[PDB]
Amino acid sequence: IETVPVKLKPGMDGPKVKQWPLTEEKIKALVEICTEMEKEGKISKIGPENPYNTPVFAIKKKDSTKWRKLVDFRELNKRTQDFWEVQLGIPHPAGLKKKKSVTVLDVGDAYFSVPLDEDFRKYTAFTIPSINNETPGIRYQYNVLPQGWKGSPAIFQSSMTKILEPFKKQNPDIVIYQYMDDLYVGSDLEIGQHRTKIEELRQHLLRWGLTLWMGYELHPDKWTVQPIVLPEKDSWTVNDIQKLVGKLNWASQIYPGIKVRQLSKLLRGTKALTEVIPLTEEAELELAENREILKEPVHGVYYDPSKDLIAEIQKQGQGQWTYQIYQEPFKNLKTGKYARMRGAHTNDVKQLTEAVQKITTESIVIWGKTPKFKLPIQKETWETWWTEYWQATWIPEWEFVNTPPLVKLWYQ
């Protein structure tokens, strides 16, 4: 029941991040939520001798209609002393990505029973803002561990084991992983039988309470990585062959032995674009050979946990989106395609925002760390609306893409 000493890193102050404007209903809802968390001792008012701040805002989580309190702990997390004291942090389970199914369970609800180190609470400062800057902002600090802080799982780490040693020993088939305030639970089981072993853990997390009710169902074994394919036609126009040679030329940056000499030859001259060109046998050969090369994966594409993960997203239209994760250009560690039906249809930014969430989930599962996104959106449009659609309790980093790539077609 005693706190665990936490420091920042030397030469770093606490976070002093501005709170951005919130709508009236989101302020109204944070006020009630923070008024219960005050009564429950989870937070306490603070005074102006506290210089620190961390933005806060309000959401609804999936298939629930109750405002939830989200705290963007990104900047504190950069400044927080990574916890390599006893253990060097929970290693990533390479087995979690190889599982027929993975369910994500919100265990943040447990964090609020652990006290936080009184020296450190000054650093979790946040502010409910007022409309129009009329009344000053309502300031609180955290007493318990904060949902969204990277220290909260690190510190619950040991204590989360003594809840899960019964279960891990009971089902040594399962892999169970924790990132932030989420529990990732993977089994090779049948899906009906995988759901049962989950509800097994919902009740086993109620027993510990005495001394968090729904299921998000990934399938890392109902997805893989994505080859570059070439069209298959009986007749080709000049345009068809120009797009081909373009795509092969781009793919040659990735796969070395790709050749376009005999297809290019057909593009000699200046025929009309919609004109059918017969393929030379040299060119049919060169195309078949390229198709070969593109069935192998890339050689020497190794993850390196000392470098950053980058995520690029392209808008393909009609609710379809593509993405690539990598560390070094052309050495993709995963690629993918996200698709519509999901409050999409008429709001690109909700699509993009959901797409950023799925990729970051897939990214936790594969490496236990979030990538830096390159978004195909104006900074100003994105910063205005992304919180209106966010549902997850973590937040990745992002920058913004302002030049339309040619590559959209190639990934198409």
Added chain:
Amino acid sequence: MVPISPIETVPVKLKPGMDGPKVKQWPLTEEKIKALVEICTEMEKEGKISKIGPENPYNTPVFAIKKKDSTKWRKLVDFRELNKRTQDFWEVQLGIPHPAGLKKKKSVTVLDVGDAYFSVPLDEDFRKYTAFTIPSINNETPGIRYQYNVLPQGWKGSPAIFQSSMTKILEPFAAQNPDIVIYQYMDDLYVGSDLEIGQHRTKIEELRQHLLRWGLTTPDKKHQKEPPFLWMGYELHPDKWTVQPIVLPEKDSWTVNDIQKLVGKLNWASQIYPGIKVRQLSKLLRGTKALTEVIPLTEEAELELAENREILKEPVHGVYYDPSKDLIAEIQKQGQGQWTYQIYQEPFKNLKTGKYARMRGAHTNDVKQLTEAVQKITTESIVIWGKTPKFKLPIQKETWETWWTEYWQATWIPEWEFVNTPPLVKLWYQLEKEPIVGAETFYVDGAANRETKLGKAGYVTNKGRQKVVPLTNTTNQKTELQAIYLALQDSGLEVNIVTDSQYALGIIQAQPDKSESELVNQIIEQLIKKEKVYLAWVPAHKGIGGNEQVDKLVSA
């Protein structure tokens, strides 16, 4: 005596790794020194300060100015080096309330808490760094020592420590007086109700006594200044507000401390006066970094400052904000990258107005400008009213749909409706997605020579039409564009164009409708006249027909 509730103390430290101030008291004239002991003697008589002994080693200078137009001396501690050693405070200073966001309340009182500042105690452990010396006459005695026991004038923490103190005291009165509103900005207390002025002036007394119970002194008699106030550059009336009148300075030659007190005095006007523009006066600045340099006024500006002496002539007032009714925002394209907006709830009655200027980009188009203004008005509305206005926008719904469905970036604007008041924002051209059957195919190419800067640009086509034009003082990027321009210039209403210029695709795929490059502008005007254009890209140096038998033509 009825006892005063004591005001709880805010702990204050120095900054990590800092001593306290150790600065000499300046030599003061003789009469100045007489005024300070006079001031400090009554202050010590009031519990505000207190003499200190020969231990306290910290010292802050103190001056005395004459309160001009008065024989009363004004004292003044100069806390600069103390502030430099004081910790940082939480700062609620971020935001000055905007008049348009105030609700219309029937009765309104403002009270200046210029005093109670000195009633708010100071952290005992921090009193001893507020020490100062009243130097003596002829330096023939020690200076009279002193430290502060309440929040000291012009100190780092005083406005923050006062504000929090004040809010604590105000919570329970508000909570149990929900039939009134109380805002809290500056050292000023805003109070307001829809109660009739008898029960309004009632609760104004009640709060006066509630403030007594802690030690806070309120202007009992009628405050000399009563609504309407001219406040912080505005004029706040019981049914309306406007900007405090501000005429524009006149100059035969405008320096830079002039055009900045003119684009500043004009950015202020535009928040209620609709249609203010400031472009041909802001170009004369960002291309200049000298606070006394002179620039004559451009030909386009001296008709513009005659427009800003033409809006600022009749009174325009804003109204107050009524939560029951919908918020509307309306935008108008004002030309040359400027946008003007009116936020209102009822026709003709503006809450507030404003402008938007394009970002200093290289190419641009009307829709991304309209989109960017919506996002500004949206953040600005969230700030002032706590909600997003419904938009009425000079763009057809069909145009917006073509744009965002085909735009390579994700984009979005909130709920809006078409207002048919020109100039309408439109799509000037649209590229085909497939090649055009029956359209002539122009394989284009360009190249220059980096040293001689010379180059060529042209096309060859499928019907044998060719052209190569020589060019002087040009670049690879310039000739790649020129090649495309030539092909548009000599083609029919429908045209397929092959280039290898990744530079060109990138410009055209951003779909500008206006450009800094006048070459790009002409391509744009050529595109506007065509019926269909398919722009295809092929990679270079593959001797890709068009771009071989014209790569071998333009580098020859």
